[PDB]
Amino acid sequence: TDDLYEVAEATYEADSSLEAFQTALDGVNTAIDDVAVSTLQTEIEELTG
Amino acid sequence: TDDLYEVAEATYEADSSLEAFQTALDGVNTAIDDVAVSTLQTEIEELTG
Numbered sequence: 001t002d003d004l005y006e007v008a009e010a011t012y013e014a015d016s017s018l019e020a021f022q023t024a025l026d027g028v029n030t031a032i033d034d035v036a037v038s039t040l041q042t043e044i045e046e047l048t049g
Numbered sequence: 050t051d052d053l054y055e056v057a058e059a060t061y062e063a064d065s066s067l068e069a070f071q072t073a074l075d076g077v078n079t080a081i082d083d084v085a086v087s088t089l090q091t092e093i094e095e096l097t098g
Contacts (some may be wrong), residue, residue, distance in 0.1 A: 014065075031082055043086065
């Protein structure tokens with residue numbers, strides 16, 4: 001019992017970690033793309049375009 | 050073994066919340082990517098001038 005219920009908790013905190021991968025990792029992906037890239041290009045435009 | 054399976058799932062609560070730390074440390078980068086790169090423009094106006 002005290003294996004299985006805690007195997008359950010292990011599965012649940014696997015799942016919770018595994019959903020949190022999708023949000024955290026994409027959180028990193030979206031940190032720069034939506035933010036630095038285009039603005040640098042606009043600052044390149046105003047500098048030199 | 051059960052007594053240590055409790056410890057296993059306790060490591061997994063911390064594991065899953067460390068995916069929350071991936072949100073809290075890695076997605077949270079985005080202010081860097083903003084403030085480094087939304088910030089030539091104010092000074093570029095002394096080129097436009």
